[PDB]
Amino acid sequence: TRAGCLIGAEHVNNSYECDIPIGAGICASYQTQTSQSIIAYTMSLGAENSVAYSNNSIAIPTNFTISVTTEILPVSMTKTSVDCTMYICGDSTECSNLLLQYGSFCTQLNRALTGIAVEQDKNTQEVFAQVKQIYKTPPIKDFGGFNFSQILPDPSKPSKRSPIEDLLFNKVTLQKFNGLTVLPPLLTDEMIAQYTSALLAGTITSGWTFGAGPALQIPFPMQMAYRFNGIGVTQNVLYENQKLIANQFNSAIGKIQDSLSSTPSALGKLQDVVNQNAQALNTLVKQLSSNFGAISSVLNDILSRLDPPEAEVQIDRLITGRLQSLQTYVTQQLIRAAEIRASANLAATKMSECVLGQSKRVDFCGKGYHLMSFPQSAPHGVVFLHVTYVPAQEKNFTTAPAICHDGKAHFPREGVFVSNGTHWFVTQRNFYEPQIITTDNTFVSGNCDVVIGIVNNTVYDPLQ
């Protein structure tokens, strides 16, 4: 290969999706269906599809689908803290006296780790503490057919967490050492769950209004009608299709818990922070067993048999080695804290602009036209349920950007012109709804002899 000489896998002419990356475009995997051996192949980038381009044909969807996707973002990590004097020079004044002669090296490290620990609480506070009041949902759930019970807290549980975030806490899984301590976060999981309950209740009962000012109650079908009006579908779409939309939303929400409970590696982004902190701490502990040149790695044994005038060099070697190891750990944690802070800023932005608003930024709150988003708390992070509008089935229609009438050229106020092949209709752009072309849904500009590709039709003036 271009990545090296690979031995053990048969080369297969046909392409598949990539499973285990090799490099230079080659991946390998275990087939189990054709080959009960290891195959290697050139990646496929995806299915080929030509698109039906032509100068006079449009494709406008006749249905839609409401899809809920999930997005997992880290917010904080465990607030660890380590003391120099015990870590490097445990309970030995004789070595601490010569640690003092290194000056401020590790008042400095304590300062850095304290900075990280203080910043974690700021991360959580900025992500979740976006509401000045705690909102509550009414006892009667008359949401026009929308079932929210999968994300609202359940009063019967000892902890007021919704089923989905309970599943999250049950899916992500998380000692006494010398000088290593772990500080508890300022906001307990109950408090974070209460924040997300406040956010969800405010969303459900007031739309986005509670992000700008006082929370203004609006009926939920009406709120969803507005959000449809947000992405260019007239509210009558929602009102005529409300039962279907509610069933579809309920099914999509139900699928989420099953997907999370059945497909592992879904919470890998959150499991990775705990794995990395655990690994860094384990390495920092294991560095205490290294000689660095010492006649013995354990402190009291070199102290107990060697007189100070020459045990001092032996102790000094250990001091410099352990101090350097601690410094490496602190630097790694600083960089990882910068990364987690970037993710927490992204999570705060996403809460603001997907939960507290309705976002026009494409692919920022999930694939499809964004409708609304639901936060769910997870251990050391947040999970977003993004509700989106996706077109489903389309038909090919002949088009023209204008209409002649008695020498006059009409353009669409809203939507596009389409035809079956006998009659011409105006329709909105994301949902096939023909209407007879009238003076009241198109507007006039210029004359026929200027625009290119225009068709003759009659337009009806309601007055006659």
Partner: protein, 49 residues
Amino acid sequence: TGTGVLTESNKKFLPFQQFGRDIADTTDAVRDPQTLEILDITPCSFGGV
């Protein structure tokens, strides 16, 4: 030598081991001389202020 709290333990030391050690180079349990008994070592408490 070392400091800590010394407690009864149920760790069946096999007849040949004389002292156990942690993942770091520090003892976790010992066998007492003159009486040959197994003794658990747990570091005695500390913390920040």
